[PDB]
Amino acid sequence: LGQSTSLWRSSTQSYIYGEYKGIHIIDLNQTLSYLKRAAKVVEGVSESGGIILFLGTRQGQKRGLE
Amino acid sequence: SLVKLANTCAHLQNCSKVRVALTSIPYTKLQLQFAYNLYQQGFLSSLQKGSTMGPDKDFVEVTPDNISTRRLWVGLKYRDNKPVLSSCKLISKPNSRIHLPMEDMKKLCSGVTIRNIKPLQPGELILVRAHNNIMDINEAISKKLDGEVLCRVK
């Protein structure tokens, strides 16, 4: 579930699958591949003993972030 | 025509600026040749005939029934957050059309400003029309063709 049809940054066009219910819908195979790539880099820096920093300013996010 | 060629160049530049992948061009012979030359040098990823609405999957023969709606679809090319086809300045403009002999073209290739043309650059391509056939300027020199210096891509 992407943002909205009227709040569209067209920079993000490649990622979006189609629109429905007045909302852009994010291509989820793409999402998956990017997530995997992200997950791998996260794993790598942890393996190397790097400092990972999780930044999440929204209301409910704190506990899961911690 | 040369005005058309300039317009297509401008369109290509615009498309490079905003990072579109696949771009339409008018369906003429000169234009097609130009597109083919770009493809072979390596500026376009794809080149294919098609409708005004999109590129064609199967072959469709072009006739008076189609011709007005026909179009030349062209894939653009990017690498390491930088577009391959940066520029498409033409040299022979409609008002001041320039036609060089082989010697002048050689000089241009070897770093000599001629007829107010900046001589051709490291990763550049000057296209040259010679008897209604667009070529690279180096190719034209090799074949020894006195021709119209068409345009310049970088």
Partner: protein, 87 residues
């Protein structure tokens, strides 16, 4: 209907926000007394309890009892509520 979109503004705020508090009890009593005295002559005993009530109200001070956060919200939610296009 005809919607009206504003341009980008520096700061959405109402110049003066009205609270709309209730009118004073003592003042009301005084008005009632005045109304009564318009009728019934100057000071007849129909308004005998009303005057007493007024006196009770206005014993310590002339009035009995002595803000709306609307700007803070507008200020908070302007950037959200805009239909301002992306950066």
């Amino acid at each position: 209907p005809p919607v009206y979109r504003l341009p980008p503004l520096p700061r959405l705020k109402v110049k003066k926000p009205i609270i709309r508090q209730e009118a004073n009890k003592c003042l009301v009593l005084m008005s009632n007394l005045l109304q009564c005295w318009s009728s019934y002559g100057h000071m007849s005993p129909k308004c005998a309890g009303l005057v007493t009530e007024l006196k009770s109200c206005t014993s310590e001070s002339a009035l009995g009892k002595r803000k709306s956060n609307i700007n803070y919200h507008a200020a908070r939610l302007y950037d959200r509520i805009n239909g301002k296009p992306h950066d």
